[PDB]
Every structure is written in C-alpha cells, then in structure tokens.
Amino acid sequence: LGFIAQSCLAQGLSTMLANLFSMRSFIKIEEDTWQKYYLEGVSNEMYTEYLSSAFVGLSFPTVCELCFVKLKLLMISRILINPGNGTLGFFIASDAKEVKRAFFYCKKKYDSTGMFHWCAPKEIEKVILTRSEAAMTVLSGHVVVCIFGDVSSALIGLRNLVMPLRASNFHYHELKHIVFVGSIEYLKREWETLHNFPKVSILPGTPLSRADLRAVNINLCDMCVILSANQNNIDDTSLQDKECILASLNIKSMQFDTTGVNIPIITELVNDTNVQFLDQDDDDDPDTELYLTQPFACGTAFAVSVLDSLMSATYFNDNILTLIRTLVTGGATPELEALIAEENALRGGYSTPQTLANRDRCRVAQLALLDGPFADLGDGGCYGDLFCKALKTYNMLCFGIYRLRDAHLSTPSQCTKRYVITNPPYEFELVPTDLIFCLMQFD
C-alpha cells in the first residue's frame, strides 16, 4: 500500500522501487524498442557501503554532491534521503563490484509525534457522499479508490494507504482528497481505524457503475486505485481479479466531453497471469515475466510477488529495509511504533518547535521538463548535464526519467503510456516530453 501511495504521488515509482529491490543482470536486445531502455533501468540495484576518507572531510554534502560524474554512481549514520544543508551511503549502481568504488577511490492539527496530519474523529455518516453531493463538489487532482468488498471479505488495512499520502512535509492545501467508492458495509468495517483522518470521503455503490465514476470526477483525478479484498475466498485462476479487470476496462472505455485511456490507474493483481488483459495494445506471452510486461513497466499494475525479493535484500543489508519504510508510508520513527504498540490508534498532540523542525524530510514528486528552467536541457540530449545542473542549483536529486513509450519511434504517436528508466547514464538521449523523479525538501 505504501508503494501504491508513492506511485500515486509520482506515477511509476512502485515499478522503480520493485526493480531496485529485485536482482537483475544486464540484458541488451538489438531491435530498437522501449524495452532496451527499460532493461537498462532495471539492471541497477540498491546497495549500501561506507564512505571513503575523502568524503569525510570539510563537509559531507558538498563533497558528496556533483561527484557522481567521476564516481559513475549515485548516492541516496542515520537514515538520510537527499541530504541538504564512517557514514553509510545508499547507492543505486548496477553491480556491487563497481559499487565498491566510492570507498576505494580517494583520488493538535498534526499528530502527536509530528509526522502526519490529524483531525478530530468523525462519524461515517458525516463523510458519506451521495451521487448528487459528490457531483456538485469540485474534485480535481484527487485520489479515488475503488474497493471490492463483502461481509466475508478480509481487512485490507487502508490505513497504510492513507498515511503516506498525508505527510507533514505536505501542506494542508497541498493535500489530495481521498474518496473510497464501494460497499458501505465493508467500508464501515474498516472505518473505525479511518475516522481519525482528514479529507476522507465514502461513496456507497460499485466501481462497475459508470454513474458513480462520473460523479466522483474521474477525468480530472490524480489517481484511481483498484483493490479487491475477496481474493482470499476465491481460489480458481479464472475467478481471481475479474472485478479488477472489468473496472479497469470500464474506466478506460469511459468517454467524457476525452477518452478514458489517458486516465492514470493502478490495479493490484494477485495473479500475474492476468496482467496481459490490462493493456489492449500489448503483446501477451505467458512465459514473459511480470516485470517485463508493459502494464508493470508503465506502473499501471502492481503485484506483491516482486516484494518477495525483499526477503533476500533485507538479510544482506538491514538498513535497506528501514530506508524503504522512510521512502514509503512517510516516516517510521521508533517513537511512532511505540505509540502504535501501546495504543494502536494514532493520536494528535499540541505543536512544539521540535515537531515543526522535523519536516525537512524530502518527498517524491514529478518534475515536468516542458515548462521550467530545464527546457533547454530537454533537447540537449545529455541527462548528466540535467543531473549536474539540478544538483548544483536546486540540490534536487533525480532518480530517473519517466518517458513516453513511442518517443523513440520517428513517427509521432498518440500513446500516453510512460515507462520508468532508473539512473540513466551521463550520455543518455533526452527528449523535452519527459518526467523527472525527484526528492524535494519542505517549503
């Protein structure tokens, strides 16, 4: 759910993290397709090592910054994510042998802890929205979550979905409204953990109904997230995920006074084999692995199977795991875990300057290259130039490039699907129509 929420903040980030955690070799195919750039992106992995003596001198960040051109790697004692203003360094390089180069080469409105927003507990009836009330309300750039549930459906635990969206470094105006569309009984069963949260609304109905999806203003939503809680009851391969596929296909086909295909949607699949039904314009081979598929590469599909690789990585570097809990679900300080252990209910406390200081933690975001100071660099064709200029000017650390599928093709195309490329080389072709994954401090 944290990966899903981060993908909501920056589309295709769940694919980025999953490919970082999985161990993949370098593969090159001769025929020119998006798959070459994707496979170059997936080859990079997450690693950790101690910094050398050269980087422990006059100041840490200034020596750490801009040195990535000579090191040919990228850096991410405490957990540090894009720092600003013998200590571990988290590297995104490809193969651990070459990663061993930095060391060798010396030449009340918030919550009590202050991590998440908070508000007074609310009744379920207060946040229930009817079709008319949802229609009149202005919802734009918001989050809509379709939930398939019954009386016998198990608890999804949507709390882990809502915490990462409302972090302290997000201003109350910058928040994205969350609307859960689905059966009222199941949502009520999970509402008790949810009533302490702000900007949450509930709409009874079903995501298969086009009227409900029109009422919640899908055409302008920032993300639509499809979940089914009944996967544990149903065992047959065919019976699994039919509701999710139908909801995705109905959202794609829905037409507005434009086509619904351009709508960003993420679907959770328990069975990888169903992934072929998600995109109509995709070649389907059952032998093809889930990460190679177009819906996963574009970030529209997520499955928990990839998370299995975590069990390996978590063993080799314990720190890595906690960094994930920092990159998703906001921050996970031990005091917060202690309060969850004691109470299990999030509680809000009166603000103090210490809590307000604990907001410098960066957050993931999309940067548009068409409009902005980096427009000239867009057509230049050097990613490393963009990397160096961004680091020098705004100290913004860019994970990678979220790129149109058919941009490499000479003939213009109407496709809107974009795939992620992780840590592109310095000599990487750049086009103006690209997105940049970045970490930004509080403002």
Binding site: L249, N250, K252, D284
Partner: protein, 82 residues
C-alpha cells in the same frame, strides 16, 4: 498461443457457448467475460457471439473498449429473450 493454434486471426467469427444449468449464473457469466476479454485481447477485430445468463452482465461486457456491437458483435441474453 492456443488462440494462435486455432487461427483466431483468420477466423470469421467466434462463438462462446454457456452452461445454462449452473449453480451460480454470475460465476458462469464471469467465466464468459474472461473468455471474451481473452479473445478480444488477442484480437479485437474478430466477431463474438456469446450467451448471457444475466442482463446486467451484458452491460458489463458492453463496457469493453474492444467490444463493437455495430459492426459484427452480438450478445444473446437468455433471461432477456425468454
């Protein structure tokens, strides 16, 4: 691959039969929606004639972007017709 074996691409039409006598009509309709989604995914242009145990499931399958009733697609709803 099995669709490549029976040559869906050159096939003029595809007919999906339904088990009218089933414990859960929604389950059979759902199996049929899997069939239709798979066949359209491999090939959207091909005609499909299918039996429909429930009328609202006909609405669900109408929501498919590949489904195009005007040209050559037909849905036979058993409950509606009876």
């Amino acid at each position: 691959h099995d669709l490549a074996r029976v040559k869906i691409e050159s096939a003029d039409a595809c007919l999906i039969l339904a088990n009218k006598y089933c414990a859960d009509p929604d389950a059979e309709d759902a199996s049929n929606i899997m069939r239709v989604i798979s066949i359209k995914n491999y090939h959207p242009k091909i005609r499909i004639i299918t039996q429909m145990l429930q009328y609202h499931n006909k609405a669900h399958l109408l929501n498919i972007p590949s489904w195009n009733w005007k040209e050559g697609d037909d849905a036979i709803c058993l409950a509606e017709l009876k």
